[PDB]
């Protein structure tokens with residue numbers, strides 16, 4: 287009954303946004319290893335008690351509003367993105383405290399190449415750096431993290447940092463984070479169709495035996511479960527090609543606040559709302 | 570691009586004092602062809618929304634029929650009976666507003682999980698509705714056709730729609746995708762299968778499959794992207810509807826139950842759409 291209890295009062299907190307990048311606190315040693323308890327929120331709030339059967343198994347988040355948050359303050363959009371890093375880690379910590387098993391984060395879409403070259407170059411380098419900067423912490427929290435996305439145009443440096451993070455965390459099981467970079471739902475489905483086509487060309491698949499499960503089995507990360515709860519910040523109400531196959535049956539909750547203002551309490555509030563609702567027939 | 574407001578003398582719809590709802594006889598157009606649709610009972614006129622802010626394609630999940638009836642001490646089938654006039658009313662309103670494409674979720678692949686008594690009713694009802702209404706739909710310049718999956722669907726339903734399709738194939742006021750036994754994943758799977766057969770026959774190189782290849786092999790490849798995705802009853806799910814096509818759609822979730830719905834609600838949803846900013850990855 288799956289939440290971590292309220293942390294010890296003196297347990298380290300996160301995030302302190304008075305420095306950039308944010309300092310992830312040193313955590314107390316654990317007597318016999320295993321994953322470390324994540325730092326509690328600055329507010330010292332505790333995760334709501336929700337039965338495991340009523341939790342969303344898989345939460346997907348479109349982390350929207352970074353640039354707007356910056357423009358609103360008369361700053362360059364890339365400054366908003368910088369604040370979003372601490373929020374990603376805060377949300378990871380809060381997902382663990384709540385007992386969420388799967389988290390997918392929309393870091394960069396196949397359509398975001400439409401943004402300015404300066405912004406694209408920044409996001410590519412930033413995602414590379416964030417992964418290197420945070421994967422040791424993620425590992426110690428028992429996070430299993432890996433890349434989900436498409437190869438063309440994506441900086442090899444980003445793929446490489448996530449590949450190391452993936453190898454480092456492949457045996458972890460507290461939570462899995464799908465770090466989606468150069469991700470597009472239609473493209474991922476297209477890539478599965480291509481893999482299916484190759485299998486058929488090789489004679490290893492009869493076209494007449496292709497089902498929905500065949501597609502699922504040939505997606506890039508076939509272990510990703512259906513999305514239960516699809517969250518988006520900034521007041522936008524669209525899925526924007528995120529987890530397209532996997533979120534076919536997801537419930538959507540749209541939260542108005544901008545990603546840099548978001549925190550784990552906001553994740554919990556959406557999960558509570560999801561959990562509280564009478565589950566309708568056929569769901 | 571709206572029709573100008575109808576004269577106060579022009580016939581109205583729906584008149585719910587009998588069942589099924591009788592569609593009124595209309596006067597003749599100026600040389601031309603399609604009849605001007607009957608105005609709403611309230612005689613309300615469509616809002617003036619410019620072409621560049623209007624949705625080209627609206628998708629509607631018609632939800633809440635059964636709960637409407639339950640609420641009133643009525644068998645669920647009575648709610649479906651009341652929703653039938655609402656479909657026509659929304660068709661009339663779509664034409665008034667200038668919507669070019671309308672997709673309606675008449676029956677999902679998940680709906681096989683309902684009671685056999687309800688499934689048998691819904692099959693026979695859709696059969697009869699298409700038969701009863703296609704002549705009117707033709708006169709209004711509606712191009713209507715079936716979108717969906719063949720296995721399990723009653724042959725009579727497919728046939729009535731095939732007849733409606735042939736009768737209205739040269740109409741161009743509005744296109745209605747009447748989606749029966751439809752599932753987004755299933756539709757994509759069916760495309761993948763078509764592609765797999767071509768690969769098996771030596772006619773397609775797997776390495777040449779692109780997103781466009783999938784689009785070209787969907788059942789109805791002419792259906793454009795969904796701009797506005799609407800669902801009634803307050804439920805915030807796409808439920809596998811127009812899955813490929815709605816990847817970048819705007820979502821509007823309205824609380825109204827479908828038998829209570831009318832064209833003014835469609836227009837209100839379109840006004841909300843008209844001042845949302847779409848980015849498609851940009852900015």
Ligand SMILES: C=C(C)CCOP(=O)(O)OP(=O)(O)O
Nearest residue numbers: 348349350392526848849850
């Ligand atoms: C996590 C975010 C917000 C980046 C995804 O951009 P999108 O392409 O998915 O979003 P829109 O352009 O439709 O606003």
Ligand SMILES: [Cl-]
Nearest residue numbers: 563564565566
């Ligand atoms: Cl329940």
